[model samples]
Target chain A: PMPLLINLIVSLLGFVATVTLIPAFRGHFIAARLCGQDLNKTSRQQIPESQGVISGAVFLIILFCFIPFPFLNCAFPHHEFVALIGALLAICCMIFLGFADDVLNLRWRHKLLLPTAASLPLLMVYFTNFGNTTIHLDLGILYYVYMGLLAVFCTNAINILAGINGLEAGQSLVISASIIVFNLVELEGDCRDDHVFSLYFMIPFFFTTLGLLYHNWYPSRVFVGDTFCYFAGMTFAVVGILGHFSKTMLLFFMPQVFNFLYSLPQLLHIIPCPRHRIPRLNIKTGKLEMSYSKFKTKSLSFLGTFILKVAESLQLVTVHQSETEDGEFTECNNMTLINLLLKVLGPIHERNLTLLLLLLQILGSAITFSIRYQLVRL
Target chain B: MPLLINLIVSLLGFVATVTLIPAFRGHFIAARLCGQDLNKTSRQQIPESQGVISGAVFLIILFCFIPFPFLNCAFPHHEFVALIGALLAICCMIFLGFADDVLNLRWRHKLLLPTAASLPLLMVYFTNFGNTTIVVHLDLGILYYVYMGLLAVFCTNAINILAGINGLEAGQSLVISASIIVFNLVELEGDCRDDHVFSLYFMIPFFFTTLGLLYHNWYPSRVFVGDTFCYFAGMTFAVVGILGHFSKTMLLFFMPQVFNFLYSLPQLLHIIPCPRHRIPRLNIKTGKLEMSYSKFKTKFLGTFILKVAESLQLVTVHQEDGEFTECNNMTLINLLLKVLGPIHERNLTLLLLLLQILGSAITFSIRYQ
Candidate 1:
């Protein structure tokens, strides 16, 4: 009952803070012309972006202020305290990286490198605490390298496949909710110090994202901007690294992992990558369509052509060979879940599309949790 | 770990049964009977009432079969005989309620059927001759069975009258079941193990099925629960309370419903010449609910009570010429809307649910102490 009371008070405070702070953030962005020009529309509309700052600020302020909450007070290990502070610092670092990307338009290399840099605080804590960094091999340079790469991947994985309204924040919400469920389940089983430890942060994030999702859902009044994406992704990364469940944490992000792999060709420059690979909006039909790029047939190795052929066969993408030219692949649609869904469902409304994908994320996390826990006892 | 396993399997089974069976029932009903004739001026042209069937059948079937998976570990010697009795009673009520939905049974028939169907549980109790028994100031003897039957009847009817919105019925069921679970947990960990031995058997299935139904039954509901779900859930609560020897705890959980029933007595008995059952009047123009009111020629008693209520600022009314009337009805749901002012359907559902939770928490604390 005490935990329940603390959780209720914390979430209520979080919800109030988010609901009140969002309008102020909106006003500030509008006055400063710091809004995202929505790319999915024909008409020009500037939406207030970087709304994640509200949640990020609220999360830090509320969490730091309530550090001595009964759940956190008794015998919460000192090393874990250091780890938590370090995680918060990492989140702050990611927020700055994201804010810079939103304001100054950083390149992909920096986008990847900066998040890795921001993860140094978390890596420092992990190195000092040195828990189970061994997953088949003993600790060495690989542990630090893997930890840093995970931080970068977590930060960017959410940022990719996020052009549509609510996809970014919505997907993070689903992941955070699953993380809370996992922690709560564990807490029920053993009443572990670590489970409650992570829950203190996870619960507030869950409520904060829920408040932001209200404004970010389809027909969104404001965009979450890159700041939210980085902060959200880094929050997960920090929890995973700090909670010693980094591998299990990645399972909840199966959708993002799948999206990243599916976009590997364009992502790695195996094919010509466009400046913006977002799914194209068809104004006439008022539906989304796969955005494609022209590729010369001669530029492809046999493995590349075979992969494209397999992708076409799987209905994951479309490839149309040019009629006029003998060796030119006139159209090859990018392979992203957004485009793949458009190809399968045939031009769904944006809101419906976002819901479908979020449902998939939920399903993905459920399956992952079940499998990871071996819960198939019939 | 066993509890976790039990919870996951029970929930998965409930989810599968509620989700899969309801779709099939909806299609069959649509193909055969043609869905319910919804009230005029309803949001959708056709809204099906397959919801009750889904929730009722799933809960009954799950409780009947999955009796031992999670519970047997904790209660190895107890063979779930009482649970089988409870499920049979719930099933019987569901069928009778479904028959009423089809036949448009009279109020007396509706009132009597639930009591009649409760015979299975009482029979089981008599045959088991369980050690637990109620003792009032005097020896009540066979009168206890009569009291138990009446308890069953009143609970079913209490929920039946309280149903107007989409989520109110199912949401209330969820909250009440959660309260029972919390109380059972408190007892399970305390010195009263024998008192609440059967609580898990009844409350677990009740919670999961209601949760599954809530997905389809929340505001902008896809299906209607009819009177079947209310009867089914209410009777389950009755059996759990009576059989588990936690009737007092269950009664505490029913605080709101009892208050609503007691407050609506005048209109319910036609003491005020009520034209219809008191439900929140949905103002479709603004999509908000207002407390429904009845009109009568200005009477001395009515005006006097109205003056007292007005002095307390508990209600609002329109007085014109020589007549006086109140907009706020006497039902608990209406009283809440009157106090909170016009609210969205979802918010109303949440407010009522929170009140249920608050009441449950108070009961839990008092019981714990």
Candidate 2:
């Protein structure tokens, strides 16, 4: 068994390096550059594109150094290296994509294509055989579908919460911390399969949050933008899937799922509304935040509106979205189920109810850990 | 689970009635005394004594209806009732305390005394040699002392945190959530030997906090005074301690210890100056927060100082404190140890670290549960 001291050192080192480097680069250069020459800043632009460049670079560096994705071959690499590299590339690609948009200004129909596009390389290398030790659902395409759904959904959720200042980073902090908990709870070979990368992804994810948090607090100075937003979130989704996808789905994503539902009513408006006409109503502040149906001039600007409502409710925030599309919308509004819970448990943010929500989150994490243990016993 | 749920429902019902009645009674009198010079704007001299009367009445009602220390004596009465009752009494006392405090009638000294006096009776009940098995390392006295220290500390910390606003309720929300998670993870045997009252204590604290939060949120609040603050915190503290008393020390009180250390830094001044006049500076914020302290004060109040100094490389927050307080105040100087985390991590909020702290707390609780 590793001494507590050693494990703690590893934890801190991993956390500090991963969290700090990107935000440092962003503040030094990118943040000022991206917000330069005037732009109507939205909640999604909270971290800005410059942060994206910095975070993306660090993400790629960490991924290449640590994670060992096939074909992007490294000489004397460990599993930690592989995990870190995979996470890094995903972050770098995300930053590149986001930077392209920030510089060239991408559209929504364009942005949505990135997660699947980025995953292609990783998927090609590590062919799917996750079915072997997965839940005995005994279905073929279902497994692939679940994996794909998780990857895309998480990648997007990470994108969505970047709307508020540090919302994505803060969410990442909690999710990364939870991932670390999952890693520590298990015995060395508990899974009898490749799952160690979950911790690898988590380490940098935690640290990046740490460094970024200094400037990315409530009234943030620098935002994570498109770059870090996509990379960190996508890396987590991809790495999580490769390691212990099912448990991550049940635990870490529940809050995100709930958030999706809470924002469902407004999100649904994108379907029928024309791209040119007034866009869907968003949850901006004032006398009636979530209630007002009036649109604010631009269509896709509502992405900020949606994020603001979410910020008012949950701790997570959205950082970036396609600014050009007056009404590019997401079809799924799954988190509405949480509203059913609020019937018995009041508003989710109510102090007592927040306690309940937190309890539920802990329970979700605990139950996932417990089940993994039971699976090991089996 | 059913028994606990029922007890909670009944207590909630009692509290709801007490809370809602005054509002309802006014409506009733308005309906009855419809026309008799019903000038609502008339000047009224509200006495400060009203707060005291309410406190004494709530205390009496709470202590009387709830199972007292002697209830365990009855052959047929449920044993869990005593724990539940004590939990309720703690909650009621907090409500009463907050009520009185808002009226500005309470002396600061009496604050510490009543809480100190209150625990011994339960201590006698809990401390009897071989009276219980849930408590680990049961040399009786040692177990009881640890339990009491933990209880007093938890109670005060909760009250202290609840005193502030903004992040205070949010912070308390996390603690309550953590407590629940810890309880569910532990799954105490639900027998007298198991001492599950800790969960019940945590529950009241949650309720009082929720009740207080309705007023004490982002905007200005009417009142958060008297027993509401103290009882909620004290009761929760009692619950956190009692539930995991049987579990390892790492599990039961570490989170609370961390929490208390965070909240109590203001009071735990260690002297640095000596020879002639003792002088020393101490940690006011334990780098962690409780519901009470979170209300009024901004945690990391000196964060700007930390940030500017980080950029300047003048000196780190930790090293600066060392020079600020001389070596003569050894005990006070020792606190710098707790504050010695890294520079990049200087901006870490109490909420951010709490998730990890809660994780550790539950991990230990899982083994205990």
Candidate 3:
């Protein structure tokens, strides 16, 4: 298979789809309009989180990237074929999961568990060939465990590092630079064979980060939220695994690993001790779902729910006041999901532009897949 | 043995007497005089850089619990001991070096040098009877090198992290916490024996940070820097090397290990070509010691001098800005050396009190020796 054809075509295609769908899926917001619930006459629903927008956009982007371009596919014949399929499936699952959370407000359990389940299909297929092949160290049962742990940690670490404004994109810049350096300077012999694949992965991360930086940098007006995080997390994991790289990821991204590990103590500290010292996850009962646990403390839940309701009420009032001052009236009743997205995205009138952007991103991603292999040869 | 002991004692006594004898220890100062000349100072004429008061105060505070009625020498010392000592040495070296950089007059570099030079000797003797004879995992050569490097870098990185004021201490606190955790938990077996060392390390660190918060927290800082970074760095390196027991220095501190290994890159980076890189060292010539080197760029000497100057500048600037407003009234001349000492003890007018404090500290340290 031609490297340039596979790499450049897929990369440009992915890039195009991402940039387009970002706006188009916001258009879907107008379509779904599935505001949370009708609990009270005075209340409306909150919009789906921005994460839904980003994840959904990535889903559309990957969906197009996977479909073979009639002519382009002939040149690059089955190159990265498995990875393409895996990428499509993974992005779709991530978006669907994010969309579910956005619409139905799935509990944290399903939020986590569904991703874990979705990853298995990719793992099962890929590992059959690549699993036993040694990359840096000898691959064994231990290696599988390490890889899985790496995957989970990468996902969560990306989410956690989004602590301050513009931090993720800035950090992504550093990670990207390190990857470029390693691929250019360090890879040897056979390991150097698929270097273009790394670049293919690199482009989406680069442009997405660059484009997002316009909106997400210091004094950010909008956030990509969990949608961007989940997609990016999976992207890092899938590419790193597919690359079957050496100590590259560990050394290159030491800063993130260190930051995430540093948080371990603080996280563990928050977990109640003794009986509930569950590893890696919070107690199932206390999870966002299972709304009412048999053994859960009613008083704690009541107080939490009350606090949330009060905060929501305050938020709506402040939003209403600002809307009135701008003389832009939203006739939608308070607390509805659609209005929430509009508030975050901008005033209600600009929502259509946001839709157009998402559509453009989807188209861009489709174009990326078509010429990925060509770009690699270049 | 007693006569030999007496002779040793007599030497110490003579040295102490000479140390106490005040001389025209270099001065253009209408004010406080020190030993080293700043611009193109001859190495011989350089005054000792280490100070007594700050060093002693740190060691004393570290032992305040030890000599107390209940927690005397009988108690099982946690990981705090070697760690604290290492910290004290590192802290003293940094403060003194930094103080020298600022004051223009070096304490002859002799004051700090002799005191610090004595540490390896004292540590070897004191740690002779620790429960674990085989202290750290590194071989003797690497271990000794680690100890030497620890003493040096603890002095340096403390100074390195201390360069900025607002977030300097807090940032340092975070870095040290990570370093300590990494050192302790990095290996499995290393975690088993002296794991409590980390707890003790953490407790003191948390306490130091908490107390520092009251002073260095935000908005207004009461005390700029109270010899703590010097102390903290020393403690980290020492504690790192000693781990729980005391033997070799390499095993306990991973950050320095990581940092130092990475630092050696410049040595490689210096090669320019594959076959030519070389390391430089002090070469005494013509009754004066100058850094002589084999390579062009006078590369080794340049980097060495550059590192010292950078360290000196960092160590001083970090602490000076942390000083409270009232301290502004003091002359920069007197303040340089004096600030390195305890606040309560800084009376130039009371020379005898200063001498007594210095003597008592010597005695206390000797007791440990």
Displacement of residue B321 (Cα, Å) in model 1 is: 63
CAPRI tier for the interface of model 1:
incorrect
DockQ scores for all the models shown?
A: 0.01, 0.01, 0.00
Clashes of 3: 81
**Model 2, position A294: C-alpha lDDT score:** 33
Better of 1 and 3 by TM-score: 1
TM-score of chain A of 1: 0.91
Give a tens-digit lDDT track for model 3, residues B22-113.
Answer: 23123212112223221122433322212222222223233222222222222232222333334333333433333333232222342334
The parts of candidate 1 lying over 4 Å away from their true place are A1-4, A70-77, A299-303, A324-329, B1-369
Q: Whole-model lDDT for model 1 versus the true structure?
A: 0.70
TM-score top scorer = 1
Task: Name the lDDT of candidate 3.
Answer: 0.38
What is model 2's DockQ versus the real complex?
A: 0.01
Query: How large is the interface RMSD of each prediction?
Result: 28.5, 30.9, 32.6
